[PDB]
């Protein structure tokens, strides 16, 4: 498992470092780290390979290294067009590479705005149809990046979660939705379920109960 920060921010002209680690083990030169950039609506582009080699035409402001057992991409003097998803790829074993989950880099262009979160429990109607969907709606945030975690009582729940990529609203802030599917018995048998939304290091958690 290759690990990258879900999202990071930088001001125009600022400096930011993205990292790329392994869940089990240290990243070293023989993982031959590669970095790819994906600007919105475009195909990925090769930035850096062999840890620190820039591909032809890549600006010098992009630098690759290994530090503290992780691969690192440093952007020094960030430009608006550097707003993109960055993917690292590590070589662990033949025949190919493993990718990190990607880091969404926002180059700040408006003030930060915290998300509003609304959580709806399953309707009685839906339960009568032998299904159960919790609905977590997230609006008015910037940067347009959040992480959503669900809990059954106090325990994390992974399976049955569908979450949208954030999209720009009318007002230029972002919105996203997350849904948790449960059986009616799961819904009834737990004390509560929670939707936890993380945005720029702050968390908002709403909880509903049968």
């Amino acid at each position: 498992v290759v690990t990258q920060e879900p999202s990071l921010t930088v001001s125009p002209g600022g400096t930011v470092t993205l990292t790329c680690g392994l869940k089990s083990g240290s990243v070293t030169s023989t993982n031959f780290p590669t970095w790819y950039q994906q600007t919105p609506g475009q195909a990925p582009r090769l930035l850096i390979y062999n840890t620190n080699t820039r591909h032809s035409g890549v600006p010098s402001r992009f630098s690759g290294s290994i530090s503290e057992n992780k691969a690192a991409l440093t952007i020094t003097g960030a430009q608006p067009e550097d707003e993109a998803e960055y993917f690292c790829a590590l070589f662990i074993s033949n025949p190919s590479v493993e990718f990190g989950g990607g880091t969404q880099l926002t180059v700040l262009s408006q003030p930060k705005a915290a998300p509003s979160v609304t959580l709806f429990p399953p309707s009685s109607e839906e339960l009568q149809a032998n299904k159960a969907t919790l609905v977590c709606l997230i609006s008015d945030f910037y940067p347009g990046a959040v992480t959503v975690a669900w809990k059954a009582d106090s325990s994390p729940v992974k399976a049955g979660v569908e979450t949208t990529t954030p999209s720009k609203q009318s007002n230029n802030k972002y919105a996203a939705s997350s849904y948790l599917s449960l059986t009616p018995e799961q819904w009834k048998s737990h004390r509560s379920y929670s939707c936890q939304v993380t945005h720029e290091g702050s968390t908002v958690e709403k909880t509903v109960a049968p």
């Binding site: 590669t34 195909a43 070589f91 190919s96």
Partner: peptide, 13 residues
């Protein structure tokens, strides 16, 4: 560039 490590220099849409 490498015999072991695929390095992806051109991607379709």
């Amino acid at each position: 560039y490498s015999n072991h490590v695929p390095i992806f220099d051109s991607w379709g849409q």
